[PDB]
Amino acid sequence: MRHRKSGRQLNRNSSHRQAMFRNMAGSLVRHEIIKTTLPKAKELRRVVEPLITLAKTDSVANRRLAFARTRDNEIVAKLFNELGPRFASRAGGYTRILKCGFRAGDNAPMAYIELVDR
Amino acid sequence: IGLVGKKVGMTRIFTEDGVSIPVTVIEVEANRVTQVKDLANDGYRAIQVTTGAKKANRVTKPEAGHFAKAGVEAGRGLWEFRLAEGEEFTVGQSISVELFADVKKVDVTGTSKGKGFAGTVKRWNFRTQDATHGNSLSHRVPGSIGQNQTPGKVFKGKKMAGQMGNERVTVQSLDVVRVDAERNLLLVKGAVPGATGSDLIVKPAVKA
Amino acid sequence: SNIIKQLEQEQMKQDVPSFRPGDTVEVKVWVVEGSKKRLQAFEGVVIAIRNRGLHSAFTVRKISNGEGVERVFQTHSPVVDSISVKRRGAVRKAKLYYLRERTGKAARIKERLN
Amino acid sequence: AVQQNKPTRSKRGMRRSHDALTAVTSLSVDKTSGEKHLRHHITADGYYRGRKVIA
Amino acid sequence: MIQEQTMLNVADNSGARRVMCIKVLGGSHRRYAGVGDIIKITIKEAIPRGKVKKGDVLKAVVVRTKKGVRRPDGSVIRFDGNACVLLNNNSEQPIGTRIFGPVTRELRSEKFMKIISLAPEVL
RNA sequence: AGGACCGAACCGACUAAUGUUGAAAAAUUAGCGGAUGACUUGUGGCUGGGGGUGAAAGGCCAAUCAAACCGGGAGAUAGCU
RNA sequence: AGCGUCGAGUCGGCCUGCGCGGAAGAU
RNA sequence: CACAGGUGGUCAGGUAGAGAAUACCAAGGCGCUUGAGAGAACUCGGGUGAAGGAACUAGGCAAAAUGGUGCCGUAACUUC
RNA sequence: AAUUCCUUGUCGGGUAAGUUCCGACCUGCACGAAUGGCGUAAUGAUGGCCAGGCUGUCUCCACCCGAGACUCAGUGAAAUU
RNA sequence: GAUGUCGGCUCAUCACAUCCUGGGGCUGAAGUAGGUCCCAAGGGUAUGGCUGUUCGCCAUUUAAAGUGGUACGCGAGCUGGGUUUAGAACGUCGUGAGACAGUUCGGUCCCUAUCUGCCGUGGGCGCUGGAGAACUGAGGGGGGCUGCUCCUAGUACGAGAGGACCGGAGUGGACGCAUCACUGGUGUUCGGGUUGUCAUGCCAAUGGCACUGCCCGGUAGCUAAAUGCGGAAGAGAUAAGUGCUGAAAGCAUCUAAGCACGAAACUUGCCCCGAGAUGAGUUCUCCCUGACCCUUUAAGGGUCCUGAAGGAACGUUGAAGACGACGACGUUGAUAGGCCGGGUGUGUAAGCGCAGCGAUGCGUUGAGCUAACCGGUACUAAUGAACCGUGAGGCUUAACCU
Ligand SMILES: C=C[C@]1(C)C[C@@H](OC(=O)CS[C@H]2C[C@H]3CC[C@@H](C2)N3C)[C@]2(C)[C@H](C)CC[C@]3(CCC(=O)[C@H]32)[C@@H](C)[C@@H]1O
Ligand SMILES: [K+]
Ligand SMILES: [K+]
Ligand SMILES: [K+]
Ligand SMILES: [K+]
Ligand SMILES: [K+]
Ligand SMILES: [K+]
Ligand SMILES: [K+]
Ligand SMILES: [K+]
Ligand SMILES: [K+]
Ligand SMILES: [K+]
Ligand SMILES: [K+]
Ligand SMILES: [K+]
Ligand SMILES: [K+]
Ligand SMILES: [K+]
Ligand SMILES: [K+]
Ligand SMILES: [K+]
Ligand SMILES: [K+]
Ligand SMILES: [K+]
Ligand SMILES: [K+]
Ligand SMILES: [K+]
Ligand SMILES: [Mg+2]
Ligand SMILES: [Mg+2]
Ligand SMILES: [Mg+2]
Ligand SMILES: [Mg+2]
Ligand SMILES: [Mg+2]
Ligand SMILES: [Mg+2]
Ligand SMILES: [Mg+2]
Ligand SMILES: [Mg+2]
Ligand SMILES: [Mg+2]
Ligand SMILES: [Mg+2]
Ligand SMILES: [Mg+2]
Ligand SMILES: [Mg+2]
Ligand SMILES: [Mg+2]
Ligand SMILES: [Mg+2]
Ligand SMILES: [Mg+2]
Ligand SMILES: [Mg+2]
Ligand SMILES: [Mg+2]
Ligand SMILES: [Mg+2]
Ligand SMILES: [Mg+2]
Ligand SMILES: [Mg+2]
Ligand SMILES: [Mg+2]
Ligand SMILES: [Mg+2]
Ligand SMILES: [Mg+2]
Ligand SMILES: [Mg+2]
Ligand SMILES: [Mg+2]
Ligand SMILES: [Mg+2]
Ligand SMILES: [Mg+2]
Ligand SMILES: [Mg+2]
Ligand SMILES: [Mg+2]
Ligand SMILES: [Mg+2]
Ligand SMILES: [Mg+2]
Ligand SMILES: [Mg+2]
Ligand SMILES: [Mg+2]
Ligand SMILES: [Mg+2]
Ligand SMILES: [Mg+2]
Ligand SMILES: [Mg+2]
Ligand SMILES: [Mg+2]
Ligand SMILES: [Mg+2]
Ligand SMILES: [Mg+2]
Ligand SMILES: [Mg+2]
Ligand SMILES: [Mg+2]
Ligand SMILES: [Mg+2]
Ligand SMILES: [Mg+2]
Ligand SMILES: [Mg+2]
Ligand SMILES: [Mg+2]
Ligand SMILES: [Mg+2]
Ligand SMILES: [Mg+2]
Ligand SMILES: [Mg+2]
Ligand SMILES: [Mg+2]
Ligand SMILES: [Mg+2]
Ligand SMILES: [Mg+2]
Ligand SMILES: [Mg+2]
Ligand SMILES: [Mg+2]
Ligand SMILES: [Mg+2]
Ligand SMILES: [Mg+2]
Ligand SMILES: [Mg+2]
Ligand SMILES: [Mg+2]
Ligand SMILES: [Mg+2]
Ligand SMILES: [Mg+2]
Ligand SMILES: [Mg+2]
Ligand SMILES: [Mg+2]
Ligand SMILES: [Mg+2]
Ligand SMILES: [Mg+2]
Ligand SMILES: [Mg+2]
Ligand SMILES: [Mg+2]
Ligand SMILES: [Mg+2]
Ligand SMILES: [Mg+2]
Ligand SMILES: [Mg+2]
Incomplete structure (x- = not known):
């Protein structure tokens, strides 16, 4: 049973998932649109959107929390200097997932996830 | 008869003499009578009731006309009481x-x-076999399921793994702790079937 | 939810004092030995607090007549007549289960004087 | 555990009575580009619901 | 929550120091004795010149448990150790003259009012 | 000093689980024994089948051993199926 | 036979036909 | 077999360490040639567990436990 | 008794309870002196027994993390009949 | 041209020659408590020490620790202690190889389930126009155990000792169902402490790796040891049994006619499934009221138009779930995520200042962070469509209306 449980395992261990979503969150902030599998896109929202929320309030503490969760100062800088400012008036929903068919190699359901004002 | 309600959740009532009564809170909104079954037309005596408030788009035209005949608003379902x-x-x-x-x-x-597909240990309280002492791949497995050539088959009703829960259950003879007609609440002592939010049919105790 | 909130809030005591893990507290409990009722004091260290509205509880550890005793009080129970902080303890943790393995000098808690 | 008797071509067919694929019931039509697409999916030219969403 | 093989401390001056539960009495397949339950015990360790001897088979009433007791408001009382009071095998009356450490109000019964009276406190 | 001690490499193989149409015709994993010696290992050499070799288990002698393998006597013989 | 009364049969061996009990088992 | 096996020699960085153990790294090399989901039973490999503590079992099998250095201290018996 | 059939001999010890164990007895079915007798410190992945510690071994299982199992796409066996 | 074996474990299922509980006759049955026989199979029916044991003895329970059948039930379910390979030894026999239903130590347990069966769960078609619901209940399944205490009553009974029936009340054991409010477990998705090391230029602060590195706490969920509930009462027909009236047979006789009692068995009552109940049931509601031509004039066939109710599909999903299924929701929208507020948990972040030689302490500060929770909120994603499903529904006969 998984009654009321959140979070997808994605056939990985916890440390792999954490590392993967840190990378993928970095990729989405950097590029503003990425193509990934639909389940990964849905989970990535729960990682990326809180980073954008954190980035609305520029402070050393918040930059360091963002750095702890991204480990990339280019990404932290973009969050606090661009995205947080860009999304200051938006109450959540900083991303949109667009389904885009099936991956050739494994028939994986694919989606684009992008920042909403890209 | 009884009424249809909703499991809100569980809490406690502290009594003045320092007893904590575990209570299931049941929200019992007005049950509106949608149909009265009689012996002449239907062959038995019953009321059909509805409760709650369904949204117009989800009410089909067959459903709407049934409610419209009764002159009541669409509720979230129909239940009969004999x-x-x-x-x-x-x-x-x-x-x-x-x-x-x-x-x-x-x-x-x-x-x-709903527990979904449940093993015999969970579903039927089967004992596990040895965790160690040489056990090969047979820790929670059911063991023997029959005899030998006589009868050369497994009997019907054999306790085996399968769907557990997500089925109708009645708990009998629960004490009514409080009837709060103003808040549309019934407080019953102890647990009742189902998750928070689920429909409950409450009837006066059959046993006494 | 909002329903259960309302049912719970009307039963909640309004006069529960502030206390923290590590405090020495005296809890006076109603004891009915027959039909006569009286207050029995239980004094000891708060080793755990469960903050959970009407379902709040706290665990008090005492050494009584040789023996370590713990009592888990249901904070809003009418059995609990009164709670009073006798001494404020300075501890880091929310839960002082480590005190179960300590006696005497090892089980001392520094006073929190502020 | 293995068969004592060779299962028939009949029995094979019967087991495969549930193997048939379901065709796409209908394709949606983008309101701008007029391209057919899977419903709730972007078009091959990168439209979705009239908007050019990718390039 | 005492079962067969559970070692208990002795909350009396009968002379036993350590006793082992060899039976939870009062029903077929009965698993556990809590506070107020009679158990069959064997004395594993005793004082030199006590009222009881090592290897004696007696009854005892469980007076403290680590699992503890629940009260009607949902409260719990738990002890650091499991303790019992040795009883005469036939009469089920306390062997010792003193009781040591707290007991609970679960013992308040004509059967064990001697233990209550002798106990240094009742919780 | 030591067929001394603890312990890697190295040599081994006591227990358990897995595996048993294996990842593997003997292993993997966790533990285990020896670890300056009657030790271990590379290269090459010698011993040949009623023969060898054997700190001896009928062990081993090319995944084969109470008499190797290959070819031959050979279509042995088979009151048996 | 029941209680001298009472007014018609009664009694139990034999041979034999057919039944009755004796007679509890495991999917 | 693009096979968790077998195969002798040589070289020997850093931090911690007695160490060629072990952990993390350097140089260097790799992610092991099906993937994607899901988060049932059951199996496998693991983590934690109230109270009890060998009651398990042929048997404490397995597991849990012990585990370092310095110092103090150390019984029967003994071929010393 | 690595030997004893009768046999779980008998007595003592250990356990609440001990066909095993330890110590005895001698009635050695069927020990016995280099196919050695009886001892014996040390040693042992050796056999038996007991205790402390320790624990999911168990009472009696619960939850969790992973790999399978399940679904989709690709490839695609087997014994048997 | 193989039908795996003792014992254990797991899971059973039936018989009744009944161990307990239920009913009853007789008793050398005062009571209590037995003995014996009859009825009764609903349910229930020990844990340990020793031994491979089954068994047995022993300890201590229990209302009781039933007896049997089921390939001495159950190894394509587990074990492998015993038996029964190869090693070795003892006693014993044998000149010896060796041997012993003597003993002793060691000693590989394979199978991915086609069919039947069983537990679950779907798809198809049917049920006669289609559709959405609510039902009836043929039939099936589950459940059915019991202690102790108190009252009645120290009454009846008894010389005492002791000590009831019947009836009533309470509280347990075992078992079962549900649940998570409580008490707790778990909680590698939350917070913190900390060892070694590597990195982010460095400091400070962080992150990676070391079993989640090791740990301490812990939210939701799941959950038991947690806490609610259950077994029934009642009814019918009975068993053994007890009778009433009563002849045959002037009597007697519970039986032949007639009538009455009588048990955990039976049929109900309680719970769950249930119309594929093809004997395919009922009730309520909803929807479709067009043209046209052929030929094989028939439940014939095709076209043009039409496309309902509703369904499905897709999407967002769920205390629903292996997949299907089932439930919620799809902008006229709280379905999910985010966001906001709260709660909860952890336990006083960072930065800065102050004190200290410094480790560190103190202030800012119960701070900061906070998953699955609660209450809200259209910010994001749930699309306009399209698709399937049709167009008044056979014949015969009756009863009524035209
Ligand atoms: C090999 C036959 C086995 C597996 C076992 C057999 O037991 C014997 O035959 C005892 S002799 C013993 C058998 C096996 C093979 C060699 C050795 C000697 N051991 C390991 C045994 C128990 C029977 C006595 C004879 C019949 C059996 C079928 C049913 C049964 O109970 C079997 C046979 C047909 C079975 O295949
Ligand atoms: K030869
Ligand atoms: K002998
Ligand atoms: K000799
Ligand atoms: K049986
Ligand atoms: K009788
Ligand atoms: K029965
Ligand atoms: K057989
Ligand atoms: K067996
Ligand atoms: K078979
Ligand atoms: K098997
Ligand atoms: K078949
Ligand atoms: K809970
Ligand atoms: K919890
Ligand atoms: K670090
Ligand atoms: K039907
Ligand atoms: K289902
Ligand atoms: K939302
Ligand atoms: K601070
Ligand atoms: K600070
Ligand atoms: K806080
Ligand atoms: Mg959720
Ligand atoms: Mg995978
Ligand atoms: Mg890690
Ligand atoms: Mg579920
Ligand atoms: Mg078990
Ligand atoms: Mg195996
Ligand atoms: Mg296993
Ligand atoms: Mg048959
Ligand atoms: Mg055949
Ligand atoms: Mg198929
Ligand atoms: Mg050496
Ligand atoms: Mg070797
Ligand atoms: Mg190894
Ligand atoms: Mg050695
Ligand atoms: Mg060594
Ligand atoms: Mg030999
Ligand atoms: Mg060879
Ligand atoms: Mg030869
Ligand atoms: Mg010739
Ligand atoms: Mg030939
Ligand atoms: Mg006859
Ligand atoms: Mg490869
Ligand atoms: Mg290789
Ligand atoms: Mg090598
Ligand atoms: Mg290394
Ligand atoms: Mg899993
Ligand atoms: Mg562990
Ligand atoms: Mg535990
Ligand atoms: Mg514990
Ligand atoms: Mg212990
Ligand atoms: Mg044992
Ligand atoms: Mg046992
Ligand atoms: Mg071991
Ligand atoms: Mg270990
Ligand atoms: Mg013998
Ligand atoms: Mg003997
Ligand atoms: Mg003896
Ligand atoms: Mg023992
Ligand atoms: Mg001896
Ligand atoms: Mg000899
Ligand atoms: Mg000689
Ligand atoms: Mg010798
Ligand atoms: Mg054959
Ligand atoms: Mg009978
Ligand atoms: Mg029957
Ligand atoms: Mg019945
Ligand atoms: Mg026994
Ligand atoms: Mg058998
Ligand atoms: Mg049997
Ligand atoms: Mg097997
Ligand atoms: Mg079998
Ligand atoms: Mg064996
Ligand atoms: Mg031999
Ligand atoms: Mg039944
Ligand atoms: Mg229970
Ligand atoms: Mg909760
Ligand atoms: Mg907790
Ligand atoms: Mg934890
Ligand atoms: Mg952490
Ligand atoms: Mg630093
Ligand atoms: Mg690294
Ligand atoms: Mg590394
Ligand atoms: Mg008469
Ligand atoms: Mg009963
Ligand atoms: Mg807090
Ligand atoms: Mg920090
Ligand atoms: Mg402060
Ligand atoms: Mg918040």
């Missing part, structure tokens, strides 16, 4: 939790929480 020898009700009558004002004990029916 009538006693005396009991009379009218179509469109609303029945409140005040029904239970003088009732001491109730039977509460709901749909149990």
